[PDB]
Motif scaffolding. Structure first.
Motif, PDB file in Angstrom:
ATOM      1  N   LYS A 137       0.871  -1.179   0.000  1.00 35.52           N
ATOM      2  CA  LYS A 137       0.000   0.000   0.000  1.00 35.52           C
ATOM      3  C   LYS A 137       0.898   1.215   0.000  1.00 35.52           C
ATOM      4  N   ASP A 138       0.300   2.394  -0.225  1.00 33.20           N
ATOM      5  CA  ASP A 138       1.034   3.678  -0.294  1.00 33.20           C
ATOM      6  C   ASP A 138       1.858   4.001   0.967  1.00 33.20           C
ATOM      7  N   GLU A 139       1.330   3.704   2.164  1.00 35.12           N
ATOM      8  CA  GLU A 139       2.036   3.947   3.426  1.00 35.12           C
ATOM      9  C   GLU A 139       3.277   3.074   3.604  1.00 35.12           C
ATOM     10  N   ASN A 140       3.331   1.961   2.879  1.00 34.60           N
ATOM     11  CA  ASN A 140       4.457   1.015   2.981  1.00 34.60           C
ATOM     12  C   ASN A 140       5.426   1.106   1.832  1.00 34.60           C
ATOM     13  N   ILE A 141       5.432   2.272   1.193  1.00 32.75           N
ATOM     14  CA  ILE A 141       6.367   2.584   0.127  1.00 32.75           C
ATOM     15  C   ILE A 141       7.052   3.930   0.462  1.00 32.75           C
TER      16      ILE A 141
END
Ligand SMILES: CN(C)CCCn1cc(C2=C(c3c[nH]c4ccccc34)C(=O)NC2=O)c2ccccc21
Length: 273
Positions: A137-141
């Motif tokens: 997901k976006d938070e984990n990139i």
């Protein structure tokens, strides 16, 4: 030791992933992130080839941390009486993709193509190492803003990759596939492609396509931004209700929308500097 080897700076953040501090490696001033988790707060445990009892997150990180890649690498770890401490790479300057999209809005297709390509390569790396991330997901990139390079973080929800069904899931719900919602059953690669369809939509629309369980399982994809027909087609394919109707990683990277991708350095020059 730890405290003679790393100079610990301010807290960066905390949550379900433990407590993460900014640090520097004392030997060469390398920027690092120093992550602490209480043993009582670890649900998933594994062991290392030599047979040490460690968080599964350590087992998975060690597997993906060899050589260069679009994964944040584990440089070291320590066991304390009531916690584990993990030493991770830290790009500087850095911004996670959630914050980047929140600040800038929907991404230009050129930029989403570059970013999405890098994420696919990073996920293929994990899979090639026998690791399923399970919370793409976006938070984990993380974006290395000077290099235009994206890096995957937070293996705390991951598992060893297998070809049989998964019946447990503790990643993010809105990135979770309809078969998990309906049946509490998914297979690793097709569930990963669903999460990548969500991520791609998020990049080009500036928000996720589904809020509720009923929208997840209805799988109707409505666009809130102007998106090319080729990009819509790829997104809808990744978000196929039937897991076996989703593309393989090969089919995604061979898709017409995925052609003529910019390398990370030119991505930075055009879009980030
Ligand atoms: C919504 N956020 C900020 C989730 C942070 C997820 N996260 C970032 C990190 C990391 C970094 C962070 C870089 N900026 C951060 C802000 C808060 C928390 C972590 C970070 C980093 O530089 N290298 C990382 O591995 C991380 C490490 C282990 C488990 C989860 C981690």
């Amino acid at each position: 030791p730890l405290e003679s080897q790393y100079q610990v700076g301010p807290l960066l953040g905390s949550g379900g992933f433990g407590s993460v501090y900014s640090g520097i490696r004392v030997s060469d001033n390398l920027p690092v992130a120093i992550k602490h988790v209480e043993k009582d707060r670890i649900s998933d445990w594994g062991e290392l080839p030599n047979g040490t009892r460690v968080p599964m997150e350590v087992v998975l990180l060690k597997k993906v941390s060899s050589g260069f890649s679009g994964v944040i690498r584990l440089l070291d770890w320590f066991e304390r009486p009531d916690s584990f401490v993990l030493i991770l790479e830290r790009p500087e300057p850095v911004q996670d993709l959630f914050d980047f999209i929140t600040e800038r809005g929907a991404l230009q297709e050129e930029l989403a193509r570059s970013f999405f390509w890098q994420v696919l390569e990073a996920v293929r790396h994990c899979h090639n190492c026998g690791v399923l991330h399970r919370d793409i997901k976006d938070e984990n990139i993380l974006i290395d803003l000077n290099r235009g390079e994206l890096k995957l973080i937070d293996f705390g929800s991951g598992a060893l990759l297998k070809d049989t069904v998964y019946t447990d899931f503790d990643g993010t719900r809105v990135y979770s596939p309809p078969e998990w919602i309906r049946y509490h059953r998914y297979h690793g690669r097709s569930a990963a492609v669903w999460s990548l369809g969500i991520l791609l939509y998020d990049m080009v629309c500036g928000d996720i396509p589904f809020e509720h369980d009923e929208e997840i399982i209805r799988g109707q994809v409505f666009f809130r931004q102007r998106v090319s027909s080729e990009c819509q087609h790829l997104i809808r394919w990744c978000l196929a209700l039937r897991p076996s109707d989703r593309p393989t990683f090969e089919e995604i990277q061979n898709h017409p929308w995925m052609q003529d991708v910019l390398l990370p350095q030119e991505t930075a020059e055009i879009h980030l500097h």
